[PDB]
Amino acid sequence: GNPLVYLDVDANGKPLGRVVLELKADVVPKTAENFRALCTGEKGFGYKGSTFHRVIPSFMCQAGDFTNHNGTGGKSIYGSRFPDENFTLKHVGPGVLSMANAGPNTNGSQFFICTIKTDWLDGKHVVFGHVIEGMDVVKKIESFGSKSGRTSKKIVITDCGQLS
Ligand SMILES: [Cl-]
């Protein structure tokens, strides 16, 4: 079936717990595979040790820039950027996992976990999974964000990988 992956997250160097994500490889196989491989690190790079650099309460928590740690970087397993696969899945509510981007066909490695329904992103960002377990951890991360997106604690993915 669809992959299950995990992110273990610290805030200011102490663990918050684990976020478990189901990746909708049946719907968006290419997008799911990129994220899966970046969690395992099997290509020699990926999310381990990187940060949630942009977190906005009552919106979303954004991560995945493992090259520049600031929203300008990241790369996919395919190359620097890859196409929007489809917009079939929608930003239905809290726990949606979706690709950050800088316009059409600019997916790399950055992603976000929604903490509310974000319908205006439908048709613009590729949704590719959702939180199975660990919304409590997501709410903790969210609580360390701000209107500007600047975090008030350093939020680090210490470990990540594939469960099934
Ligand atoms: Cl484990």
Curated annotation (Swiss-Prot):
Documented EC number(s): 5.2.1.8
Description of activity control: Inhibited by cyclosporin A (CsA). Is displaced by CsA from the mPTP leading to a lower open probability of the mPTP.
Post-translational modification: Acetylated at Lys-124; deacetylated at Lys-124 by SIRT3.
Keyword presence, NAD: no
Family statement: Belongs to the cyclophilin-type PPIase family.
Subunit structure: Associates with the mitochondrial membrane ATP synthase F(1)F(0) ATP synthase; the association is increased by inorganic phosphate (Pi) and decreased by cyclosporin A (CsA). Interacts with ATP5F1B; ATP5PD and ATP5PO. Interacts with SLC25A3; the interaction is impaired by CsA. Interacts with BCL2; the interaction is impaired by CsA. Interacts with TP53; the association implicates preferentially tetrameric TP53, is induced by oxidative stress and is impaired by CsA. Interacts with C1QBP. Interacts with MCUR1.
Protein name in the entry: Peptidyl-prolyl cis-trans isomerase F, mitochondrial
Species this chain originates from: Homo sapiens (Human)
Residues of the full protein shown: 44 to 207 of 207
